[PDB]
Each structure stands twice: as structure tokens, then as C-alpha cells.
């Protein structure tokens, strides 16, 4: 249970994503690649862009092969597109192996690259079902497992930031570890609890109960997973379905009512500040998500602190103050357990056993009164089915799966 060479292999800027160094092609072209458990393509900048100072140059790679097929990927914010091919890929601070993987060479994009994020590509770690153009495009991790003896598992320790912040002009630096093929015991303390992967597409899980400062939200538990709940390293916030978001904000407002914040704050559109080191952490409640256990009628809870859901941002004009962004936000596409959740925990993506593990992170941000926690079991007699069944479209139904 030791992978010393892979510890501390993640870097990034607060709110702009965690990246790992990867090499592509022969000779190796080193690139910084976003670790994204919410998508399934390996896609790298492959042409000049304002926000890039390096990119994948296919012509410099003797081992590159063009697949003679394009790919176009639209999403809420914008799009990326490019040419599909294969090349040799390694992770210099990962396993001592080289694999031939699919690579999408991004030729054009809109609102994809983030200025100052320091990454040039994305490593989609989710399953083939959500790969583009379709599920025949084998994701990177699938290739890695198939071509090597690397166990079908990876784990993420994402370490967040906090005051005092070093720079006023630029965003705070974050770090972490991606352990490929195993679990490193130095990265967590206490018990490691597993929730089933409900289905292999996103890393979909089931939330059975939500509490805010020990108070049950008392909603039909299907509402927690409407229309899915996923674990996504490529999302910053904890994102909650509309009804759940409104109930949670109501509860957090009530707890912190001594402070009257503007509407913009609760919408994540405005910072709120206190004089340096005087932030009244104790007026903000802990949030507990109970996840379905491996055993029928069992659950366990993960509990996060306001230090996780209030993100530090050092303002240029307000450098005397500690300022924060509210990092819980509304979703119309289900619950997203983003960096806000993950930064409390060591998270094990145990693909081999179709489960996701949580333990208290050795690096989580806390104070002297409360800690992020992973606790169980909690037993519920005749536990209900909290999973939502997405209405089946004719287009989806018509697909064959040979």
C-alpha cells in the first residue's frame, strides 16, 4: 500500500482543475493534462491558442497514426473539436509503462481552455459509454489496463487551498496525488468506506440522505439523485438538483443568519469578506451526504466543512481581508460531487469491483473544532430505492450494442 513515486503528482490553480504531467508521442512531448472523472476522452490542444504556450505536434511524433476521422464535442459552455488518432502515451510520475492510446488532437475550441490554468489537455477517466464520437472509442484508462498489468483502479487525493494566501494577483496553487493501479495508505486516515458504482458511464453513485448541521432535509431520497449523482474531479462545486439546492441554501442561510449576505453571494456571483483570520467558521453548518453502502440497508456518511464549500479568493483591493465564494450551486443534470466534496477525502475509483471508496484525507483543510469525516455504518430497515430512472429516448433505445 505504497506508491511513493506517484504521490504529489497533481498540480493546479484553485477552481481551474487538477492536472497530471503526461507524455505523448516519440520522442515524448510533455503536456499538463486535466484529471477529469466526468468525461471519457483523451483530448489535447494540437494547434496554437491564446491560452497555450505548448501543444501536441503530431508531425514531431514518429509513432503517431491518424485515424482519419474527426470528433466534435459540444457542451453547455462551448465546444472542442479535432482529429482522432493514436500515439504512445505515458505518465512520467505514474506507472512505469507506455501504452498506445486514442488521442483527440484539438484543432478548434470555444470556452474550453482556461487562461492561467496551466493545462493543455484533458484526461477523461470515466467509461466508454460517454466517450465521443461513440463508445467504440476506447478511453485511456481502458487501454492502460488492457495493455499492461496495471490493476483496474485509481485513487485521487485532491488537496485544497486556504488562508493566508501567498499571492494577491494570481489564484492559489493546489496539489494532490493520482495513484494509478492502487491505494496509498499514507494519503488517508481512519476507515475506507465503499459505495457501489450504480452504472458504468459517469461514476454514478446513490445518495440516500442529506443533513445540514445534523438536520435531515427530509426529502424523497430520489430527489437527491435526480436525474443522477456523480463523482466529478472536473467540476469545482458541489452541485445539487434545484429542489435540493433550495432546501440546502435555506438551511445554511438559517444557520449563518447573524450575517446578512447579498443574493449574489448565495448565487456564487459575489465574494464575502472578513478581516484576516476572523472568519466566523462556526456559524456555517457541516453538510453530510449519506451514500448507499455495499450492504443492503447500510449507508455511510461523508461530512464536509464550510472550509470546503467556501472557496478562498484573494482580492487585489481587499488584500487585508479573507474573502470567499459560495461553492454550492444549482444543477438541472443531477448531483455533482465536485472538488468541494473530493477535497475532504481520499477517493478510490475501484473499477475492478464496481465501487467508489471514501476516507478522510491526510491533507483536508480543517480547524480545531470540526473535521471532515467518513462515518458508518448507518442501518435503515427496509431501505427504499433512491435511484432515478432516466426516461428512455427512442434514439437511445435504437442503439445496438455489439
Cell output for 211 = 443533513
Determine if residue 129 is left, alpha or beta; phi over 0 gives left, psi from -120 to 50 gives alpha, anything else beta: alpha
Residue span binding ligand 1M4 (CB under 6 A) among the ranges 44-52, 94-102, 157-165, 231-239: 231-239
Q: Minimum Å distance from CB 128 to ligand 1M4? A: 15
Set 87, 232, 322, 350: catalytic member = 232
Can you say whether the dihedral through the CA atoms of 394, 397, 398, 399 is positive or negative? positive
Determine the Cα–Cα distance for residues 241 and 334; give it in Å rounded to an integer: 5
Cα diameter, the chain: 64
By rule CB under 6 A, what string of x and - marks binding of each residue 116-145 to ligand 1M4? Answer: ------x-----------------------
Smallest distance, Å, CB 10 to Ni ion? 12
Binding partner at 75 among ligand 1M4, Ni ion, none, C-beta below 5 to 8 Å by kind: ligand 1M4
Is residue 400 near Ni ion by the rule CB under 5 A?
Answer: yes
**In the set 25, 121, 234, 293, which binds ligand 1M4 (CB under 6 A)?**
234
Task: Using CB under 6 A, pick the residue from 39, 279, 331, 361 that binds ligand 1M4.
Answer: 39
Could you confirm whether 321 is annotated as catalytic? Answer: no
Check binding of 261 to ligand 1M4 (CB under 6 A): no
Residue owning grid cell 481520499:
346
135 binds Ni ion, rule: CB under 5 A: no
17 versus 85: smaller Cβ distance to ligand 1M4: 17
Give me the phi and psi of 199, to 5 degrees please: -155, 145
CB of 307 to ligand 1M4, least distance (A): 22
Q: Would you count residue 21 as binding Ni ion (CB under 5 A)?
A: yes
Residues 6+ apart with CB under 8 A from 279: 163, 322, 324
DSSP letter for each residue of 120-184: -EEEE-S-GGG-SS-TTS--HHHHHHHHS---S-EEEEEE---SSPS-SSSPPEEEEEEEESS--
DSSP string, 243-291: HHHHHHHHHHHHHTTTS---HHHHTTSS-EEEETT---GGGSPPEEEEE
110 is catalytic: no
Q: Which is nearer to Ni ion, 34 or 291 (CB)?
A: 34
Q: So which residues are the catalytic ones?
A: 36, 232
What is the binding site for ligand 1M4 (CB under 6 A)? 17, 34, 36, 38-39, 73, 75, 112, 122, 232, 234-235
Amino acid at each position: 500500500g505504497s506508491f511513493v513515486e506517484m504521490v504529489d503528482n497533481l498540480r493546479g490553480k484553485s477552481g481551474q482543475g487538477y492536472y497530471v504531467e503526461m507524455t505523448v508521442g516519440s520522442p515524448p512531448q510533455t503536456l499538463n493534462i486535466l484529471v477529469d472523472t466526468g468525461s471519457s476522452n483523451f483530448a489535447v490542444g494540437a494547434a496554437p491558442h491564446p491560452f497555450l504556450h505548448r501543444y501536441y505536434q503530431r508531425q514531431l511524433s514518429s509513432t503517431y497514426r491518424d485515424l482519419r476521422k474527426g470528433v466534435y464535442v459540444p457542451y453547455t459552455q462551448g465546444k472542442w473539436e479535432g482529429e482522432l488518432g493514436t500515439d504512445l502515451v505515458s505518465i512520467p510520475h505514474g506507472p512505469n509503462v507506455t501504452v498506445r492510446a486514442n488521442i483527440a488532437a484539438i484543432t478548434e475550441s470555444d470556452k474550453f481552455f482556461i487562461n492561467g490554468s496551466n493545462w493543455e489537455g484533458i484526461l477523461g477517466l470515466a467509461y466508454a459509454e460517454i466517450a465521443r464520437p461513440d463508445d467504440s472509442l476506447e478511453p485511456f484508462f481502458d487501454s492502460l489496463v488492457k495493455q499492461t498489468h496495471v490493476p483496474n483502479l485509481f485513487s485521487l487525493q485532491l488537496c485544497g487551498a486556504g488562508f493566508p494566501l501567498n499571492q494577491s494577483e494570481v489564484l492559489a496553487s493546489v496539489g494532490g496525488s493520482m495513484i494509478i493501479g492502487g491505494i496509498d495508505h499514507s494519503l488517508y486516515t481512519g476507515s475506507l468506506w465503499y459505495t457501489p458504482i450504480r452504472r458504468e458511464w459517469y461514476y454514478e453513485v446513490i445518495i440516500v440522505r442529506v443533513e445540514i448541521n445534523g438536520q435531515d432535509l427530509k426529502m424523497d431520497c430520489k430527489e437527491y439523485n435526480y436525474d443522477k449523482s456523480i463523482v466529478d474531479s472536473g467540476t469545482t462545486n458541489l452541485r445539487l438538483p434545484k429542489k435540493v439546492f433550495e432546501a440546502a441554501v435555506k438551511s445554511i442561510k438559517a444557520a449563518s443568519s447573524t450575517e446578512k449576505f447579498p443574493d449574489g453571494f448565495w448565487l456564487g456571483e459575489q465574494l464575502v469578506c472578513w478581516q484576516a483570520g476572523t472568519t466566523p467558521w462556526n456559524i456555517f453548518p457541516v453538510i453530510s451526504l449519506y451514500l448507499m453502502g455495499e450492504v443492503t440497508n447500510q449507508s455511510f456518511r461523508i461530512t464536509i466543512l464550510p472550509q470546503q464549500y467556501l472557496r478562498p479568493v484573494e482580492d487585489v483591493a481587499t488584500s487585508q481581508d479573507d474573502c470567499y465564494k459560495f461553492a454550492i450551486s444549482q444543477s438541472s443534470t443531477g448531483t455533482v460531487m465536485g472538488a468541494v466534496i473530493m477535497e475532504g477525502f481520499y477517493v478510490v475509483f475501484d473499477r475492478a469491483r464496481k465501487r467508489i471508496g471514501f476516507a478522510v484525507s491526510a491533507c483536508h483543510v480543517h480547524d480545531e473544532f470540526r473535521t471532515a469525516a467518513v462515518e458508518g455504518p448507518f442501518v435503515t430497515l427496509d431501505m427504499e430505492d433512491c435511484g432515478y430512472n432516466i426516461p428512455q429516448t427512442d434514439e437511445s433505445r435504437s442503439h445496438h450494442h455489439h
